[PDB]
Each structure stands twice: as C-alpha cells, then as structure tokens.
Amino acid sequence: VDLEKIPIEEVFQQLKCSREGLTTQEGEDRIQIFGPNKLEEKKESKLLKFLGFMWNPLSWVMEMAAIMAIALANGDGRPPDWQDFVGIICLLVINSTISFIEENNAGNAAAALMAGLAPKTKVLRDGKWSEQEAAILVPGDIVSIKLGDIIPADARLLEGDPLKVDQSALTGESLPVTKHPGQEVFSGSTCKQGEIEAVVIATGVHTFFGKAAHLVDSTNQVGHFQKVLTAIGNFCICSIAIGMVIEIIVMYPIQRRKYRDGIDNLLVLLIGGIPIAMPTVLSVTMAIGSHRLSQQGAITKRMTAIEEMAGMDVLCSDKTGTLTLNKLSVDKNLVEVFCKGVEKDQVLLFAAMASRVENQDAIDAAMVGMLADPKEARAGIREVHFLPFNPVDKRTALTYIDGSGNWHRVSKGAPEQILELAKASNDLSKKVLSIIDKYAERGLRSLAVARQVVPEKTKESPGAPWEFVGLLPLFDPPRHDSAETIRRALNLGVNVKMITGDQLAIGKETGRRLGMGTNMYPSSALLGTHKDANLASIPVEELIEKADGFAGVFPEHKYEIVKKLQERKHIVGMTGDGVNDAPALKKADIGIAVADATDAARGASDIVLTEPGLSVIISAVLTSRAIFQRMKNYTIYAVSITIRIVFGFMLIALIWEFDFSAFMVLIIAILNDGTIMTISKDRVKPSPTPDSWKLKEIFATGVVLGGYQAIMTVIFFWAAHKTDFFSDTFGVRSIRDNNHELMGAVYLQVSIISQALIFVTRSRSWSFVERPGALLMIAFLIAQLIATLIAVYANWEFAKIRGIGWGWAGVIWLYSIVTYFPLDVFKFAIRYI
Ligand SMILES: CCCCCCCCCCCCO[C@@H]1O[C@H](CO)[C@@H](O[C@H]2O[C@H](CO)[C@@H](O)[C@H](O)[C@H]2O)[C@H](O)[C@H]1O
Ligand SMILES: Nc1ncnc2c1ncn2[C@@H]1O[C@H](COP(=O)(O)OP(=O)(O)CP(=O)(O)O)[C@@H](O)[C@H]1O
Ligand SMILES: [K+]
Ligand SMILES: [Mg+2]
Ligand SMILES: [Mg+2]
C-alpha cells in the first residue's frame, strides 16, 4: 500500500508533499486541474437524455392519446387525427420547454443554496488560516481539523494530542476510535473529540468509501413529496377513466352511437383532463421557496422540508443557542473565591488565561474581554500547551512557564467536572454547590476556575493536586425578539418548548423573563418509565406534551423527548448545535441546525439556518406556510379544472349528442399551460394554523368547484341550443343547431371560467377582496384576449369552429362574469366543512 494501514509516516509527507503547512495556492491548482476532486459526477448527464425530454406517467397517457387518434383513424384513413397528433406533440414540446427551462432557472438560483450546504474544509494557505470548500481540497497537503468537522479525505494525523473519530455507518461500529499522530483517518468520519493538524492523503473517490461504491441504486426512493404528487396525478387520471373508459364507452352501445367518429369525446377528456402542468408547477414552487428561504436566512438542505415546516406543531428550542444571545457577562460582586490568596478581581484573569484568544468560543471571547484589556490575558505568560473544550470533559486548561522557569497551569470548566480534578473535601463541595444553586436561583450559569503547579516541569506529567480557585456567575442574556417570537409562534400555532442542559432553576428563571411559562421539568425525571415521579397520575408522554420545556437535557434524553412528542402525533421542530444533537436532529420531523452549529449537526439536520435565533425559525415557518398555501391552491385548481373538463364535454355528449372539438380543448390546454407559471410567483397569505396537506379536502374543494363550472357550462349549452333564451335577450346573432358557431361559444365560455378559477382557488376570502397582482391579471387578460379573438374570428373547418361575433362574445363574457361570483360562495361552502 502507498500509505493506508502501513505507517510510512513522516517519510510519506516528505517523499510526496515535499513541503509543510503553508503550501501555496498555485501548487494546489496544478494538481486540482490534473484530476483530483472530491467525488464523481452522476451518470446520464450526456446528450440531454432526460434534460430535454420528459417521461412521467401523465406523458405516457398523453402518448397513448396521440397514438389513439392515429390508432382510431386507421393510420392515414382519417386526416384530422394526425393534425391533432402533431398538435398533442406540440403541447408536449411546449410543456417540456417551459418545464425544463424553469427547473433549470430554479437550479441556477439554488447554486448559492447548494454552495451554502457543501462540505467545507479548513486550511492554511500562504500562511493564512482559511476555510474552503471540500472540492478545492488537494490530496497530499496539510489541513487543520477541529471538533465536529467532517473529515473530507483520507488523512494522516500530523502532531498533537490523540482525538476520537466516529466511523459508524462507514464501518458500522458504534464506538468512536482514538486516533494518534501518524495514524490514518478516512473521509466521512466525524470527530467526537479533540483537535489536531493532519496531512490529507487521497480524495473521497480513492477513499475506501468511494472504492466500496460499485453500482448506483435507488437512494431515498420513498420520498413523500413525489408520492403525494403522484397521488394528485392518480386522482385526475382516475376521473378521466371514470369519465371516458366507463361512461363514454358505456354510452356507445347502450344508445348505439357512432363508433369511429365518437372517439373525439374520449380524446377531449384525455387532452384537457391530464394536468401535465401540475408536476412542474409544484416542483418549481418549492425551488423558488427555497431561494426565498435563502434570502430569509434558512438553507433547505432538504428541499421537501417546506411541507413539514408548514405542518410544524411544536418547536423544541435550545435556550443557549436560539433563545439567548451567548455573549455571557459576569458581575464580579457575586464572584466567590476559595483558596484565599487569590482574589475576586484576579480569578477572572485565570479564566481569561484558560480561554483561546484568536478564534474564540463565545464564553472564551467574553472572558478574554471581561478584564477590559485583552493584552492582559496573554501578557508575557509564555504558554506551552492548551487543552481545548471536550464535551465529556467540560474543561479547558492553559500550561505556561513563568518567572524563573516555574511551570504553572490554570483551567476553566463545568464546576462538577472541575470539582473532580482534585476530589475536594465535602465541606468544599457543599459550599461550591450552594453558591452554584444560588447563582441558578439568581438565574446565572456557573463556570469554575482551578490552578495547579507541575513540579516535574514536563508536558506529560500530572501537576500538583488542583486548587479549587473559585467559580463565577454568567448571565445568558435573552435576545430582544425571542420574547416576541414565542408569542408570535403561539399565535401561529407552534408551541415553543425550552431545551437546555442547565438545571431547572436557570431555565425557569430565564424562561420567566423570556416569557415562556415555568411548567417545565428535568428531562431525567421524565426519561423512560422507570423513574416514577407520579407517572401513574400523569403519563410521562402526557406530561411531556403539557411541559413547557425540559432542563438538564442530555443527548439521549433529547432524542427521547422528540420521540415522545413525535409519538404524540405532533410535528416536532427541534434545534441543534453539537456532535451529539445529530440523532435527535435526524429523527426530528424538522432538524434545525443553528447558524454556528457544528458541520456534523448541519449534515444531520433537514434544514440549516445561516442566521441566528428563534425569530429566524418562526419567520421561516411563517414564510414556509405562505409557500405551502399555493401548492394546495394550485392542487385545488388543477383538480377543479380536471373535473370541469371531464364532466362538461361528456355530459353535453350524453344529453345532446354534441361532439366537442379536440383541437379547441388542445388550445385551452396550451393557453392554460402558458399562464400557470404565474401560480408559483403568487403572493398568497400564510395559513395561521399549521396544515398537513390533506388531499381529500383539496380534492373536495376542487371537485365541487369544477362540478359547478361544468353545470354552468351545461346550462350555457342548453340556453343556446334546445331553448331560445340566449338569443331571446339581445340576440345579435341566434343559433341552435349551428354547431361550428355553437362550440366556438362553448370554447370561449369554458376558457374564461377556467382562467378565473385561479382567482377563486388562490383566494381564501372573496376573490375580488384579495388583490390578484399584475402577473395573474396579465396572464388572464392576454390569454382571454386570445381566446376571445379565436372565438370571434376563427373559421376553421378542421377545428369544427366558425367565428361568432364580438356582440355574442360579449354576452359570453357577461355570462362568465355573473357565473364567476357564486364560485366563492361554493368555495366557502365546501371549505366550511
Ligand atoms: C371571521 C368572521 C368574519 C365575519 C364577517 C361578517 C360575515 C359575512 C362575511 C361574508 C361571508 C364569507 O366570509 C368568509 O367566510 C370564510 C369562512 O368560510 C372565512 O375564511 C376563513 O375560514 C376558512 C376556513 O376554511 C379559512 O380557510 C380562511 O383562511 C379563513 O379566512 C373568511 O375569512 C370570511 O371572509
Ligand atoms: N469553552 C468553555 N470553556 C470552559 N467551560 C465551558 C466552555 N463552554 C461551556 N462550558 C461550561 O460546560 C458546561 C456545559 O457547557 P455546554 O456548552 O455543553 O452547555 P449546553 O450545551 O448544555 C447549554 P444548552 O443545553 O442550553 O444548549 C457549562 O457549565 C459551561 O459553563
Ligand atoms: K430528520
Ligand atoms: Mg462553546
Ligand atoms: Mg448546546
């Protein structure tokens, strides 16, 4: 092996890389353009095989419709079916052209979104500590790896303390493995612990994970959005089958109708009934919504999270990450010291000493500045090693050489862990815990400092038993708008529940000034069923739903808390930040990574914020509902147009044996298809309650609207055929059996009402009251001007249509206008129940 398991070690970098650390950018480019990149491109992009050509189920039925015209014409026996057949292909060509250009445009607008969620690596280039995308990474170079980084390539650790990497999933072993200088690590691994520099070996394609991958197979096959999209497709296809395959076929021999030339009634049901617009419009609506979220501040790593975000019912929010600022502050009056000889004004300095000073943890950054002059924190101390924060240790420490060569060490950490650095007298333990609990009653978190000296003047030897120097009170404080945001979320029907590892007194005290209510519990009490605490009086699951927040949350508890809420049917949003939030984020309905979350948390989460605070999440939830509203309204529209077309033309054929022009319906479909890319760009107001995309309600809303429109179409036909009524009042013309003129009028009436239905379906109140905006009006007016012009002037024997004057068309416009107003009353009536 060139490297791998065998340790070529220090020789290997010198033999190949031939340089150390600061490797110039020009050197990377030559090997980058040679061929190394993180991973291979997906198969079948060549020749625009599926990027210029569609093949959804609806297109398959449309292909049958085109063939059916040829099939039922005996090939060249009947000429107009071929004219329809080329027309059907032209509609498919037009639909495909608009479909694929808009998705391409949406994909171009999501490049920044894809860029935001890309794997990113941290490097020092020209001596400049920098962060770069992982596709820029060069095999054989030196990189910097921090806790919770995703390892981007094979790498050999360079120097520095052992750290723990998690090989689970890649190798399927739960326990993370300690990795030492010189040892190899692999792409896709996540650091559970520690921090080290390393030399990357080979790109992910050369990594064993890339070697293992042979033949590509279905990935996320069961994705819910596609299944509901198919179900909307299934219902409209069923309606055509109910309309055509049964009843129209049923009426042919019961009444002994014409056969060969009756098939046009089947073709109109196919050509107008099938909404090939419907999958494209919904597909691009989410894509533009994600770009809106990218503007908003939320990067939808999962594109389908809009449905879950719209349906979200409860949001479990980390107090430290989302509810509170995290520029912690200490009033030194309440700092209490021990091991006197140290003093209240000086124990802050030790905390500043044990804080990193350049790239800073939020608490580290505060304490560097808390002594007023940041130079004082580092002034002449001559540090020799720094021990960085680790979640199992909860501790930092600085080792330094001072005076005549004394080796001293100072440390910060969580006080319970600091109290075990030298297990103190229980008198001391009771005293420190009393002030810690007093700070918690005050509402302030506690950090403890400690000090030791090492007599053996060496990095690797334990020093003298630690002094428990003291511990200091740190304020959260709340963000300005989180206090509003809980109220806003409550109004929008999402219950915000606090999550924190802080003891309950901190959470309630912060929570009361936040405004969240204090009916909240230690998670450990409610974890499982074995901890009692009056479980019989209130089930833990029932109590958890009632609870307004959870304190002392460990990561096992956090997964359980969402799981219990998710089992209680609630759609659970949950924020996360760290390496051990990943399973809770994965199992949550919406995993939300906070802006400063670890990349492991960003990978595990469905959605990744790039802007901090609970306020951002509620704005994203509110915006997501506004995007979600128009998917339902188009689905109501798409079903409703399908029902009116399917019912209308067959029903006149059933009653008055009237064959409608297939080409005219084809014209309606193209005009509809040309105008429905307004719908994605509408400005519907969000639903206030969460909503879960109940298909039955939207189908019920659409079918009643379409049935009413079909009924008014049938009334229009009867008015201008069997009876004299239409020309009795202001008959500029008069027609009954003038079928080519008559169906031109039917075309014009159907087209206007079909376009107007967009205004009904988008609006929740009166269609007039909710303003349309210019694009929808222009799409309506241009389409209906063209529809009017065809109705007035088209003398086409091929299309069975004869031009019927503007005065008559004006009556059709007037009839459509007075038909339109009770659509809202029908819309209100169906969605009342
Ligand atoms: C909120 C009550 C307002 C009463 C105003 C005075 C009475 C007469 C108003 C005209 C009659 C129609 O009034 C209209 O009814 C429907 C309910 O079906 C309301 O619609 C409301 O309930 C439906 C429930 O499905 C929601 O989808 C919708 O988002 C919501 O706005 C409209 O907000 C209201 O404008
Ligand atoms: N860089 C750091 N240095 C020293 N101590 C730190 C530290 N960061 C956190 N601590 C301390 O460790 C303990 C827990 O820290 P941690 O960051 O895990 O909080 P947490 O994530 O549990 C709050 P929440 O659950 O609300 O997100 C606290 O007492 C804290 O003061
Ligand atoms: K998830
Ligand atoms: Mg931190
Ligand atoms: Mg945290």
Residue numbers in the entry: 12 to 844
Text taken from the publication that reported this structure:
The Arabidopsis thaliana plasma membrane H+-ATPase 2 (AHA2) is a member of the PIII-subtype of the P-type ATPase superfamily. It pumps protons out of the cell to maintain a steep electrochemical H+ gradient and potential across the plasma membrane. Structural organization of AHA2 encompasses a cytoplasmic headpiece formed by three domains; the nucleotide (N) binding domain, the phosphorylation (P) domain, and the actuator (A) domain, as well as a membrane domain composed of 10 transmembrane segments harboring the proton binding site and the translocation pathway. Additionally and similar to other members of the PIII subfamily, AHA2 has N- and C-terminal extensions involved in auto-regulatory functions, the latter being considerably longer and referred to as the R-domain.
